[PDB]
Subunit: 115 residues, 4 copies
Amino acid sequence: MIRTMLQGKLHRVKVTHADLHYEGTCAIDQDFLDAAGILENEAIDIWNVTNGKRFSTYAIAAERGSRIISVNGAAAHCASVGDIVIIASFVTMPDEEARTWRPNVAYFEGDNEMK
Amino acid sequence: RGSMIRTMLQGKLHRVKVTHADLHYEGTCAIDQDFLDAAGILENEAIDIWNVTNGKRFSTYAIAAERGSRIISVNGAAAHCASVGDIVIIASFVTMPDEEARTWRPNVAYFEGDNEMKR
Amino acid sequence: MIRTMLQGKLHRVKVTHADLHYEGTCAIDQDFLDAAGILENEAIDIWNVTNGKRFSTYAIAAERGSRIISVNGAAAHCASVGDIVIIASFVTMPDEEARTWRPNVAYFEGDNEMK
Amino acid sequence: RGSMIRTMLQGKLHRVKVTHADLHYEGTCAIDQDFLDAAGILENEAIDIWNVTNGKRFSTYAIAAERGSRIISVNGAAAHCASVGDIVIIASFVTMPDEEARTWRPNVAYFEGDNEMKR
Ligand code: NA
Ligand code: NA
């Protein structure tokens, strides 16, 4: 059987931009994507610690070192600048592999400073 | 064998406008076949609809509307989630192994006006 | 690439029972499951035409011919007796097969009379 | 090859009670490893939580809490969706080909009282 497993997680990043009108696509500092194993164009779940909203989208890379978490398009209805969110992706694999799988978790403090 | 499988954006229709929404007398969401083609979306494929106007997010499937009709019809229970005039994003996601995912290019079609696909 | 496709749909069935406390598991007349290709223990989506709620659960079989649609446990917060719902399941398959895939759709009127 | 793949209930914890819920200082949901074993749920597996008390439904993942702790800890953003004392159902779903799905038996564990697993 095939299991759905946490691939990686950005833990407690702060939303830095949220534009309904002008922008549409969610964007995340490429360094953060790299640490969590999350890919450009991959499905992600965003869990908003500030307001409790939970939604699914995909992200593209923001510039390395920018520390950007940009939640745009329709998703701007779900997060505001300054909200603390958790961003996760999930992968599937057979049960035998899933039993030893290790996700990639990156922790943040302050203004999206990775620990 | 046993490769880790990613869920990736296959394609999307960016900022199409809902043209029809009927709760009672229709059920199935329908999208102009030309639009489905541009986004690589199939008839009967699962789609996510993200409503830019009201923020609602939901999952359904679509059938093809007549080519050239420019229809985006959100019917059945989903008519509680969108209305005629609303701007929505319609996406489909596929699964593939990690290596393919890392160079995958989604099929994105951009819209304006009367559901005119931009060049 | 692997596509997620509609497997089958029960179109406009009426909820006949909704018990939060006593029962937990959603149940559907086995004849209806058979017509839609939906399996016992399969993930299903329920889209409530009456109140707009959309949720995911799984169902077990109710007695053949009972015409039961029972929405119980936590899901009783999402539907009431008399609500009209659409129940769907989805399967995955490769793109090449998905292009010709045909879902199983069953239509209903009145008191869960299949057409 | 090309078999149609079903999403099936793998297992569930039926009517466990939330024992801890911390928004700010913790993130990860945790479940007594004995409970994970009984339901066939893995550490880091996607789970659905259906809150019997308040009707909220959400998806997350769990890590193992100490065996015998009887912990059901719903933390991070998910602490907006459950509270200590709430009765919840925790399910995981797996995928498999249609033939296997048709005879698949989910791993269901039933609870009462102080998160006591019924025989
Ligand atoms: Na407009
Ligand atoms: Na109790």
